[PDB]
Coordinates of C-alpha atoms (C1' of nucleotides) in Angstrom, one line a residue:
Chain A
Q1 CA 126.1 104.8 80.6
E2 CA 125.3 108.7 81.7
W3 CA 127.6 111.1 80.6
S4 CA 130.6 112.7 82.4
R5 CA 130.1 116.2 81.2
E6 CA 132.4 116.3 78.2
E7 CA 130.0 116.2 75.5
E8 CA 127.5 118.5 75.5
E9 CA 130.3 121.2 74.3
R10 CA 130.9 119.8 70.9
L11 CA 127.2 118.8 71.2
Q12 CA 126.2 122.5 71.3
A13 CA 128.8 123.8 69.1
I14 CA 127.8 121.6 66.0
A15 CA 123.9 122.5 66.8
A16 CA 125.0 126.2 66.5
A17 CA 128.0 125.4 63.3
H18 CA 124.3 123.5 61.6
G19 CA 121.4 125.5 63.0
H20 CA 120.0 123.6 65.2
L21 CA 117.7 121.8 62.3
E22 CA 118.0 118.1 61.9
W23 CA 119.7 116.8 65.4
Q24 CA 119.8 113.1 64.2
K25 CA 123.2 113.8 62.1
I26 CA 124.4 116.2 64.9
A27 CA 124.0 112.8 67.3
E28 CA 125.8 110.8 64.8
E29 CA 128.3 113.2 64.3
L30 CA 128.9 113.5 67.9
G31 CA 129.5 109.4 68.3
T32 CA 128.0 108.9 71.5
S33 CA 125.9 105.9 69.9
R34 CA 122.8 107.0 72.1
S35 CA 119.3 108.1 70.3
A36 CA 118.9 111.9 69.9
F37 CA 115.8 112.3 72.0
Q38 CA 118.2 110.3 75.0
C39 CA 120.8 113.3 74.6
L40 CA 118.9 116.2 73.9
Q41 CA 116.9 116.0 77.0
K42 CA 119.9 116.1 79.2
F43 CA 121.6 119.1 76.6
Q44 CA 118.2 121.3 77.0
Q45 CA 118.8 120.6 80.9
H46 CA 122.3 121.9 80.6
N47 CA 121.3 125.2 78.4
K48 CA 120.5 128.2 80.0
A49 CA 118.4 129.3 77.1
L50 CA 115.4 128.0 78.9
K51 CA 115.7 130.2 81.7
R52 CA 114.9 134.2 81.7
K53 CA 116.3 137.3 82.9
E54 CA 115.6 140.5 84.3
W55 CA 111.8 141.3 84.7
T56 CA 110.0 144.3 82.6
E57 CA 107.2 146.1 83.0
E58 CA 104.5 145.1 80.2
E59 CA 104.9 141.4 81.2
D60 CA 103.4 142.4 84.5
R61 CA 100.3 143.5 82.9
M62 CA 99.9 140.0 81.1
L63 CA 100.7 138.4 84.7
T64 CA 97.6 140.6 86.1
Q65 CA 95.2 139.8 83.8
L66 CA 96.1 136.3 83.7
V67 CA 95.7 136.7 87.7
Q68 CA 92.0 138.4 87.7
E69 CA 90.9 136.2 85.3
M70 CA 91.9 132.6 86.9
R71 CA 93.1 132.8 90.2
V72 CA 91.4 131.7 92.9
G73 CA 91.5 132.0 96.7
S74 CA 95.0 132.4 98.3
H75 CA 96.2 129.7 95.4
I76 CA 97.5 131.4 92.1
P77 CA 98.0 128.9 89.1
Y78 CA 101.6 129.5 88.0
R79 CA 101.2 126.7 85.8
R80 CA 99.0 128.7 83.6
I81 CA 101.6 131.5 83.6
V82 CA 104.4 128.8 82.6
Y83 CA 102.1 127.8 79.7
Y84 CA 101.1 131.1 78.4
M85 CA 104.4 133.1 79.4
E86 CA 107.0 131.2 77.2
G87 CA 110.6 131.3 79.1
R88 CA 109.6 131.4 82.8
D89 CA 110.1 127.8 84.6
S90 CA 108.0 126.5 87.8
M91 CA 110.4 126.9 89.9
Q92 CA 111.6 130.8 90.1
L93 CA 108.5 132.3 88.9
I94 CA 106.4 131.8 92.0
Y95 CA 108.6 135.2 92.9
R96 CA 106.5 137.0 90.8
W97 CA 103.5 136.9 93.1
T98 CA 105.5 136.4 96.7
Chain B
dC1 C1' -4.5 59.7 25.0
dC2 C1' -1.8 62.5 21.8
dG3 C1' -0.1 67.4 22.3
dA4 C1' 2.9 71.1 24.5
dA5 C1' 6.4 72.1 27.5
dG6 C1' 10.3 71.1 30.6
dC7 C1' 13.6 68.3 31.7
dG8 C1' 17.1 65.2 32.7
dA9 C1' 20.2 63.3 28.8
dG10 C1' 24.9 60.7 25.6
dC11 C1' 26.6 62.8 22.0
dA12 C1' 29.9 65.3 18.1
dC13 C1' 33.8 70.1 18.1
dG14 C1' 40.3 69.3 11.7
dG15 C1' 45.0 67.7 9.9
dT16 C1' 49.4 67.2 11.1
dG17 C1' 54.4 68.6 13.8
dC18 C1' 40.8 52.7 59.1
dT19 C1' 41.2 52.3 65.0
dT20 C1' 41.2 49.8 68.9
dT21 C1' 39.1 46.9 71.5
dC22 C1' 40.7 41.5 73.3
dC23 C1' 41.8 36.1 73.7
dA24 C1' 45.8 34.1 71.4
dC25 C1' 49.2 31.9 74.9
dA26 C1' 54.4 32.3 72.2
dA27 C1' 57.2 34.3 73.5
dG28 C1' 60.0 38.6 75.4
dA29 C1' 61.4 41.8 80.2
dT30 C1' 63.2 41.1 84.9
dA31 C1' 65.9 39.2 87.4
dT32 C1' 72.4 37.3 89.8
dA33 C1' 77.2 36.5 88.5
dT34 C1' 82.2 36.5 87.9
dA35 C1' 85.1 39.6 85.6
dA36 C1' 89.5 41.3 83.0
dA37 C1' 89.0 45.6 80.4
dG38 C1' 88.7 52.2 79.4
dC39 C1' 85.9 55.7 80.0
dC40 C1' 81.8 58.6 81.2
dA41 C1' 79.1 61.6 85.6
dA42 C1' 77.9 63.6 89.5
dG43 C1' 80.0 65.6 94.2
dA44 C1' 83.9 66.9 97.4
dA45 C1' 88.9 68.9 98.0
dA46 C1' 92.6 71.1 96.3
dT47 C1' 94.7 74.5 93.1
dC48 C1' 95.7 78.7 90.5
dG49 C1' 94.0 83.6 88.0
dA50 C1' 91.5 88.3 88.8
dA51 C1' 91.6 91.5 91.2
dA52 C1' 90.4 95.4 94.7
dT53 C1' 91.1 97.6 98.9
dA54 C1' 96.1 98.6 100.6
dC55 C1' 101.5 99.8 100.8
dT56 C1' 106.1 101.8 97.6
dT57 C1' 107.7 104.9 94.8
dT58 C1' 107.3 108.9 91.3
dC59 C1' 105.7 113.4 90.0
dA60 C1' 104.1 117.7 90.0
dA61 C1' 103.4 122.5 93.3
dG62 C1' 104.2 126.1 96.1
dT63 C1' 107.6 128.0 100.4
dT64 C1' 111.5 127.7 102.0
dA65 C1' 117.9 129.7 103.8
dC66 C1' 120.3 131.3 101.6
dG67 C1' 122.7 136.4 97.9
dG68 C1' 123.8 139.7 93.6
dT69 C1' 123.7 143.7 92.5
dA70 C1' 122.3 148.4 92.8
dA71 C1' 120.3 152.7 94.3
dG72 C1' 118.8 156.3 98.2
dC73 C1' 121.0 158.9 102.4
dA74 C1' 124.6 160.1 105.9
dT75 C1' 129.1 163.0 107.2
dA76 C1' 134.0 163.1 107.1
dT77 C1' 137.3 166.7 104.0

DNA sequence: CCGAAGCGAGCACGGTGCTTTCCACAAGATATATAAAGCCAAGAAATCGAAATACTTTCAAGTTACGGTAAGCATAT
């Protein structure tokens, strides 16, 4: 069975109280009868730390270097930017050249 | 007719511990025939497994309609 949007709060609370070291004990103390890998995916999907914030200037240098080094025609491989630049997903990163 | 010289020679060398070509004619070989019985054995007909050239669905990617605050400039008091 899927979640009911009521266990992620206690999950992140226990993860912050323990230090995000061992997710197995966290899942066992949470009492969901599910594997740690099955709940960690939804935890990271509901987490906000995976995203980014207002754009700086020093990262523009790296983006321009990566473009001038591995861009082809009118297509830009933003997946390479996701691989190199941490924090940027594939959805909202394309705006960096839109 | 004896004499010299080769010359071939029996004689010794210790104790022990077979193939094929024909007359012999007396058997063999090949010949049906039931007849029950299961199996082996090659030629078709039916059946099923592997899969490739196709269809559904999943999944990555960018471009899409729709804001979230924030900053430079006009004009009233």
